[PDB]
């Protein structure tokens, strides 16, 4: 149907006996989740929540968080998720920037808006007016690199267009088990949640436990019988180490879907020798929050493991696209350019960032294009290959540097897991190439990199970290690495 509410309604009306949520040994049926959610919506209505309103959600992953989010959607409102490892100042900003009429869960400088507590939500375990396709389902905040975190509001019709685009490339059924691996404040959780709840499938909630190892994660994945696993490449590399080390088998896995980072063939090779490429399928998906979770699809093949190219494949069925030169021109085959995207999954622009919206969402004088700020090429055969972020193609003292190439060159060192390379302003006068990396001292690393890279591309300073700092989506927080570096210097 038109909305996420419709999707849940259909599946719940039609498969009420099936398990919607699985939290350790706890199982909630679609039927009972549906009941709980209708009740929560009525409760939200009573507290003065209206269609088009925005409600904060702040809860650990579990039954209550999910039921609250359905209740919020059923009430015609958008949920604005706050991840609880988010620093208090970040919530405080989002709470005010998004102007929520209420918060669900427990809390922040001002509490003066109304609360629905977790205990309140647990208690409820024709209705308010239903939302339309053009109503906002969620508002997820992305990283603003200097300037503030920015909010992206995604509509019901945006999300429902996502699952329609994917209907024929994936083979999903009510029998699947989806893992909720990701933060509810990361849009990859939307795919995970609604992947399950739109089809009658089961959603396995990874309960919140920070001392859980990859090894434990692997063990749950086998034991809870997961068929659809979503991972960032960073997460999957560590998962693979654990699966291979303990020798875990995963015969029930049907799909592993990658998103959110550049997926290198090297990351995938160890997996592929153990399980092959036929089961599960490996699917790389390029995506951005501004165009609703995923924008492309590429099933991995043996060929992708021969070269070192990052194939992201073709735009999802809903999309039209451009590959654009610095000049505004359409790029030739094999030529790198900026990817632009148009279609029903593209968001309506940022929240309260009117000038940024103006720049990155454009209409000719024609489709409405979102400028991804990502560099890609169309290879012969029509597949997209991902090159890198225009952000990270920088210039320094007369040379152009692919920061991402330096990074990979540092990663080429066998004892190095991860690297972040950037231009650091030591002073206005002194701008130099810097690297942070995780496990080899700087001396050995520096000596190795002098092999791989031209001299202008060699990091001027190396900082060894126990781990790289992480935003809640599990990516390396670049602004956090630069600040840690600066303070250690
Ligand atoms: N399959 C992929 N291969 C390569 N890069 C990817 C892939 N999927 C996502 N990315 C990168 O991740 C980004 C999408 O991230 P998201 O929408 O969460 O915001 P962000 O890039 O983390 O920050 P912002 O929204 O502030 O630009 C894209 O800019 C792209 O560079
Ligand atoms: C799933 C992944 O592509 C997510 N939308 C991100 O933008 O980081
Ligand atoms: Mg981006």
Q: Residue 339: nearest ligand to its CA?
A: 1
Q: Ligand 1 within 6 A of 404 CB?
A: no
Classify domain 391-489 by CATH number. 3.30.300.30
Q: Ligand 1 within 6 A of 285 CB?
A: yes
Q: Are 180 and 229 a contacting pair, CB within 8 Å?
A: no
Preceding-residue numbers of gaps in the chain (C–N over 2.5 Å): 107, 125, 365, 439
Three-state SS at 213: coil
Distance of alpha carbon 402 from alpha carbon 395, whole angstroms: 9
Other residues' Cβ atoms within 10 Å of the Cβ of residue 269:
11
Buried b or exposed e, range 453-474, using 16+ CB within 10 angstroms: beeebbbeebbebeebeebbbb
Buried b or exposed e, range 144-163, using 16+ CB within 10 angstroms: eeeeeebbbbbbbbbbbbbb
186 Cα nearest atom in ligand 2:
4
191 Cα nearest atom in ligand 2:
1
Whole-number Å distance, alpha carbon 286 to ligand 1 midpoint, is 8
CATH homologous superfamily of domain 1-390?
ANL, N-terminal domain (3.40.50.12780)
From 138, 181, 186, the mutation candidate for ligand 2 (largest count of ligand atoms within 8 A of CB) is 186
Q: Ligand 1 within 6 A of 286 CB?
A: yes
Q: Ligand 1 within 6 A of 259 CB?
A: yes
Distance of alpha carbon 473 from alpha carbon 234, whole angstroms: 11
Q: Ligand 1 within 6 A of 262 CB?
A: yes
The DSSP secondary structure of 419-442, one letter per residue, reads EEEEEEESSSS-EEEEEEEE---H
Give me Rg for the CA atoms of the chain: 23
Nearest to 288 by CA among 477, 475, 422, 66: 475
- Identify the residue whose C-alpha is closest to ligand 2 atom 5: 293
Contacts of 213 (CB under 8 A, 6+ apart): 242
Q: Is the dihedral of CA 289, 293, 294, 295 positive or negative?
A: negative
Q: Ligand 1 within 6 A of 393 CB?
A: no
- Beta 361-363 vs 418-425: how paired, if at all? unpaired
From 144, 145, 187, 288, the mutation candidate for ligand 1 (largest count of ligand atoms within 8 A of CB) is 288
Distance of alpha carbon 76 from alpha carbon 419, whole angstroms: 43
End-to-end CA, the chain? 56
Expt. technique: X-ray
Whole-number Å distance, alpha carbon 289 to ligand 2 midpoint, is 6
The dihedral over CA atoms of 361, 364, 367, 373, expressed in degrees to the nearest 10, equals -40
**Helix then strand then coil, % of the chain, to nearest 5:** 35, 25, 40
Exposed, middle or buried, 98 (CB in 10 Å: 0-12/13-18/19+)? buried
- Residue 211 has what DSSP assignment? T
- Residue 384 has what DSSP assignment? E
- Identify the residue whose C-alpha is closest to ligand 1 atom 4: 262
Whole-number Å distance, alpha carbon 71 to ligand 3 midpoint, is 30
From 183, 236, 263, 286, the mutation candidate for ligand 1 (largest count of ligand atoms within 8 A of CB) is 286
Q: Is the dihedral of CA 151, 153, 158, 162 positive or negative?
A: positive
> Token pair 């690199």 is at which residue?
145
Q: Ligand 1 within 6 A of 389 CB?
A: yes
263 Cα nearest atom in ligand 1:
3
Q: Is the dihedral of CA 39, 40, 46, 48 positive or negative?
A: negative
Element (H, E) at 145: none
Distance of alpha carbon 232 from alpha carbon 284, whole angstroms: 10
Q: Are 345 and 319 a contacting pair, CB within 8 Å?
A: yes
List, chain by chain if needed, residues with CB within 6 Å of any ligand 2 atom.
187-188, 259-260, 287-289, 293, 473
- Identify the residue whose C-alpha is closest to ligand 2 atom 8: 260
Element (H, E) at 91: helix 88-98
258 Cα nearest atom in ligand 1:
1
Distance of alpha carbon 400 from alpha carbon 392, whole angstroms: 10
285 Cα nearest atom in ligand 1:
1
Distance of alpha carbon 285 from alpha carbon 315, whole angstroms: 9
What does the domain layout of the chain look like in residue ranges? 1-390, 391-489
CA dist list (Å): 116 to 39, 60, 64, 121, 472: 13, 15, 11, 7, 24
Distance of alpha carbon 307 from alpha carbon 264, whole angstroms: 10
Q: Ligand 1 within 6 A of 191 CB?
A: no
- Identify the residue whose C-alpha is closest to ligand 2 atom 2: 260
Contacts of 82 (CB under 8 A, 6+ apart): 56, 57, 58, 91, 94, 95, 185
Contacts of 363 (CB under 8 A, 6+ apart): 369
Nearest to 216 by CA among 239, 250, 247, 244: 239
Nearest to 409 by CA among 443, 445, 376: 445
Contacts of 110 (CB under 8 A, 6+ apart): 95
Element (H, E) at 388: strand 384-389
- Identify the residue whose C-alpha is closest to ligand 2 atom 6: 260
Which residue ranges are tagged as binding site for ATP?
142, 150, 260, 284-285, 287, 289, 374, 389, 475
Distance of alpha carbon 65 from alpha carbon 121, whole angstroms: 9
Other residues' Cβ atoms within 10 Å of the Cβ of residue 26:
12
Q: Ligand 1 within 6 A of 288 CB?
A: yes
Contacts of 134 (CB under 8 A, 6+ apart): 155, 156, 157
> Token pair 């290198």 is at which residue?
264
Whole-number Å distance, alpha carbon 173 to ligand 2 midpoint, is 23
Whole-number Å distance, alpha carbon 287 to ligand 1 midpoint, is 6
Three-state SS at 70: helix
């Amino acid at each position: 149907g038109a909305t996420l509410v419709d999707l849940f309604s259909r599946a719940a009306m039609e498969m009420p006996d099936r398990t919607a949520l699985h939290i350790d040994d706890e199982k909630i049926s679609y039927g009972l989740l549906h009941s709980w959610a209708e009740g929560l919506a009525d409760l939200l209505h009573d507290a003065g929540v209206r269609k088009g309103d925005r409600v904060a959600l702040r809860m650990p992953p579990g039954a209550n968080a999910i039921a609250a989010m359905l209740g919020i959607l059923r009430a015609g409102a958008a949920y604005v998720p706050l991840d609880i490892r988010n620093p208090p100042a970040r919530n405080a900003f989002i709470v005010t920037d998004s102007q929520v009429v209420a918060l669900v869960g427990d809390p922040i400088p001002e509490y003066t808006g109304p609360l629905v507590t977790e205990e309140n939500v647990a208690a409820l375990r024709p209705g308010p007016e239903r939302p339309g396709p053009q109503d906002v389902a969620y508002i997820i905040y992305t990283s603003g690199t200097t300037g503030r975190p920015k909010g992206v509001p995604v509509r019901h019709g945006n999300v429902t267009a996502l699952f329609e685009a994917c209907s024929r490339l994936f083979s999903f059924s009510a029998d699947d088990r989806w893992l909720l691996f990701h933060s509810m404040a990361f849009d990859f959780s939307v795919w995970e949640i609604w992947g399950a709840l739109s089809t009658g499938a089961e959603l396995v909630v990874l309960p919140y436990w920070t001392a859980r190892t990859p090894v434990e994660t692997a063990r749950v994945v086998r034991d809870r019988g997961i068929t659809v696993l979503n991972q960032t490449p960073t997460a999957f590399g560590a998962l693979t180490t654990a699966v291979l080390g303990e020798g875990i088998d995963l015969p029930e896995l049907r799909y592993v879907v990658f998103g959110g980072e550049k997926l290198t063939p090297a990351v995938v090779r160890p997996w592929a020798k153990r399980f092959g490429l036929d089961r599960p399928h490996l699917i790389n998906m390029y995506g951005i929050t501004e165009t609703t979770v995923h924008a492309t699809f590429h099933r991995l093949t043996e060929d992708d493991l021969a070269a070192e190219d990052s194939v992201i494949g073709r735009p999802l069925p809903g999309f039209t696209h451009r590959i654009v030169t610095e000049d505004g021109r359409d790029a030739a085959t094999g030529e790198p350019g900026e990817l632009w995207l148009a279609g029903p999954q593209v968001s309506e622009g940022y929240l309260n960032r009117p000038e940024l919206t103006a720049e990155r969402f454009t209409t000719g004088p024609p489709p409405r294009y979102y400028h991804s700020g990502d560099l890609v090429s169309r290879r012969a055969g029509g597949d997209l290959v991902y090159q890198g972020r225009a952000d990270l193609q920088v210039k320094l003292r007369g040379h152009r540097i692919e920061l991402s190439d330096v990074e990979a060159a540092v990663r080429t060192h066998p004892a190095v897991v991860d690297a972040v390379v950037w231009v650091h302003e030591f002073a206005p006068g002194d701008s130099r190439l810097v690297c942070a990396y995780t496990a080899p001292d700087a001396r050995a690393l520096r000596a190795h990199v002098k092999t791989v890279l031209p001299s202008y591309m060699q990091p001027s300073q190396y900082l060894a970290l126990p781990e790289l700092p992480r935003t809640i989506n599990g990516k390396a927080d670049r602004a956090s690495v630069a600040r840690a570096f600066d303070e250690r210097r």
